[model samples]
Target: CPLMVKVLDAVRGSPAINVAVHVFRKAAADTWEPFASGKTSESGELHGLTTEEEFVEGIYKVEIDTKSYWKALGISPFHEHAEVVFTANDSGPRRYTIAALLSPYSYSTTAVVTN
Candidate 1:
């Protein structure tokens, strides 16, 4: 199954485009390995960032470069990064959607299992 990630601006309720997003897999204790990397598209979404061919069950991390995003917008970002950790379950639905809402000082995420 593939994974969909969407980035949004919490303050304006708009898509956050061009944000750098990285997917990492937990390799060991305190060790993370890069699985995939990409920036948000014009639609502020990364559909199938981890396609079905590369999908795997494990502890995964999604890191967003909020500081750089804010810098590019000429605003000060309170946090350098917005990170979310989740567990991908093999027994669950065929796909997952992670929606990340972000502001200059805060961020939140929600995950949904899909077919």
Candidate 2:
């Protein structure tokens, strides 16, 4: 499966958070290993991760380093991390877009709207 994510926060009025995307594969019942990483664009958006075919079926997770992202603004966040886990139907070629919203107090993730 292919995965891409976007992150945004209300505080990103002029300057933006230094958001990063981390990919991990299920190594155990509760353990994961890092696979890929990238920083979000100026609009807090990231893409082109659909090429990661190593993440096969079962459960995979994506984590955002919120603390580091917020720390760039000299603000401490109540939530230091945000993650989303999902099952991929197959490891073959496919495109998946994930979107995430973040704030000082809350965060959310969803599939991107493709038209």
Candidate 3:
């Protein structure tokens, strides 16, 4: 099965920041394995996570490197990392979109699932 995903900074008018998104599978009841990894584009968008020709179905996790993105702009972030964990039973039956917004002090994640 193949999984597709897109990520963007939901906040408007913020400087472009480098963000790393990691896709991990829950290997066990609590363990994980890295499945895919990518950095956000200059416009804070990530496209073609699917067409890049890599994906698998299971419990997936997304992690954003907030600390580094702030450091590049000479600001200090309160959180070291931001992450979201989600599950997909069959990749073909649903569309998953995750978005993140970051500030020097806050972060958020959203998911959309359709059967």
Per lDDT, the best of the predicted structures is 1
**Global lDDT scores for all candidate models:** 0.85, 0.72, 0.67
Cα lDDT of model 3 by residue, 5-100, tens digit? 344443445534457777787886688888777787776665555632344466788887877877876887788878888876664556566777
TM-score of candidate 2 to 2 decimals: 0.77
- Global Cα RMSD, each model: 1.6, 3.1, 3.4
lDDT of the structure predicted as candidate 2: 0.72
TM-score of each: 0.89, 0.77, 0.75
Error of 1 at 2 (Å): 1.3
What is the C-alpha local distance difference test score of candidate 1?
A: 0.85
Ten-residue stretch with the least lDDT total in model 1: 47-56
Model 1 regions more than 4 Å off:
none
Give the lDDT of residue 65 in candidate 1. 87
- Pairs of residues clashing in candidate 3: none
lDDT of 2 by residue, 1-115 (tens): 3577777786765423458779887877678977678888887767665464564666778888887877777887888689888877753456667777777778778975332
Q: Select the stronger candidate by TM-score from 1 and 2.
A: 1
